Every structure is written in structure tokens, then in C-alpha cells.
Design a protein around this ligand. Structure first.
Ligand SMILES: COc1ncc(-c2nc3c(n2C(C)C)[C@H](c2ccc(Cl)cc2)N(c2cc(Cl)cn(C)c2=O)C3=O)c(OC)n1
Ligand SMILES: [Cl-]
Length: 93
């Protein structure tokens, strides 16, 4: 994964935008750096990870699960995370 990935400018689809609005200000275009941070903040604040197994996010009982299409995932699975995120946005140039 290149460092340039974080510079990608994106327009969230409605479900992603809904989630983002619960953790950050509503603007039209976000960087991937922004999207990752806000989704990360969402996971941390809502305690969707378990303190006894801190790499795994459980989202079966959360909007995030609908966003990503999985009951759980590992925060270490970066390629997978980017794919899950990408399906919820449009890239802009
Ligand atoms: C409890 O302590 C504890 N500490 C730390 C983490 C944690 N590790 C990581 C993350 N976090 C949180 C901000 C969620 C964060 C992340 C952000 C958004 C999502 Cl959708 C999923 C994970 N991420 C990254 C993934 C990618 Cl693809 C790129 N980049 C740049 C990352 O940084 C990680 O590698 C964590 O996760 C539960 N829990
Ligand atoms: Cl929810």
C-alpha cells in the first residue's frame, strides 16, 4: 500500500456519510486520510473492538456491519479495509 493512497479525494455514498456525520463535520469531499481517521474514531468511541482481543472489530450489531458487509474484521487487514471502504464512496479528480 502506497502512502499516496491517503491523499485520494473521495465523495461518500449516503450510508458512509451518515456514519461520518456522527464523528466529524459534514463536507462534500474527504481525503482517504480523513475517512480512515473518522471511521477509526467511530470504532474506538463506540467500543466495537473488545479490550481482550483488540485487533478485531465486531460490527454485526452496528451500521458499520452494513457499511462493510461483514460481522467482523481485523484492523491489521489493510487491503481488505480499503476495499470495504471503497465500495461506499466515489473517487474524485
Ligand atoms: C483498543 O486499542 C486499539 N488501538 C488501535 C486500533 C486501530 N488500529 C488501526 C486502526 N485502529 C483504530 C483507529 C480503529 C485503524 C483503522 C481505521 C479505520 C478502520 Cl475502518 C479500521 C482501522 N488502522 C488503520 C487501517 C488502515 Cl486500512 C489504514 N491505516 C492508516 C490505519 O491506521 C489500524 O491499523 C484499534 O482498533 C480496534 N484498537
Ligand atoms: Cl449503529
Amino acid at each position: 500500500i502506497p502512502a499516496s493512497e491517503q491523499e485520494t479525494l473521495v465523495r461518500p455514498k449516503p450510508l458512509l456519510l451518515k456514519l461520518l456525520k456522527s464523528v466529524g463535520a459534514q463536507k462534500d469531499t474527504y481525503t482517504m486520510k480523513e475517512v480512515l481517521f473518522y471511521l477509526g474514531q467511530y470504532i474506538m468511541t463506540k467500543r466495537l473492538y473488545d479490550e481482550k482481543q483488540q485487533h478485531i472489530v465486531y460490527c454485526s450489531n452496528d451500521l458499520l456491519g452494513d457499511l462493510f458487509g461483514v460481522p467482523s474484521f481485523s484492523v491489521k487487514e489493510h487491503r481488505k479495509i480499503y476495499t470495504m471502504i471503497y465500495r461506499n464512496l466515489v473517487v474524485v479528480n
